[PDB]
Write a protein that binds this ligand. Structure first.
Ligand SMILES: [Zn+2]
Length: 49
DNA sequence: TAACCGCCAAGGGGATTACTCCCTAGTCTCCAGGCACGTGTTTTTTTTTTTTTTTTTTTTTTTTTTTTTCCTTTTTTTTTTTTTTTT
């Protein structure tokens, strides 16, 4: 709380959300509101360009 | 005390001569086990793959949340400047 940190979306949260089977909440909590990024990738090599 | 010698007596069987006979020496003639040559099938050796247990390695240990405390080098060797003594 002193560093103003968010809650821990742990393993069993992903387990019970897979049990509910709603993919959009998983895509929100684990990609949209945690650490989104955009990278550019070469098509032939498949690595970071 | 009976070995040994001398003397005498008796008899038993090996040597001798002749007749016989029969078994083997010798000589063909057929054929068959004895032997020279080739080889085997068990016996030992060597590989080969597995087995079975032991040892080693590696990975694991429910989740979330909130406060402090200590530390986040250190000695040890080398260098470089400074100070003092001498001619
Ligand atoms: Zn490329």
């Amino acid at each position: 709380r002193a560093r103003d940190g968010g809650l821990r979306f742990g393993e069993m949260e992903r387990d019970c959300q897979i049990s509910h089977g709603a993919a959009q909440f998983l895509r929100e909590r684990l990609f949209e509101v945690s650490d989104p990024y955009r990278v550019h990738i070469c098509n032939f090599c498949g690595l970071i360009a």
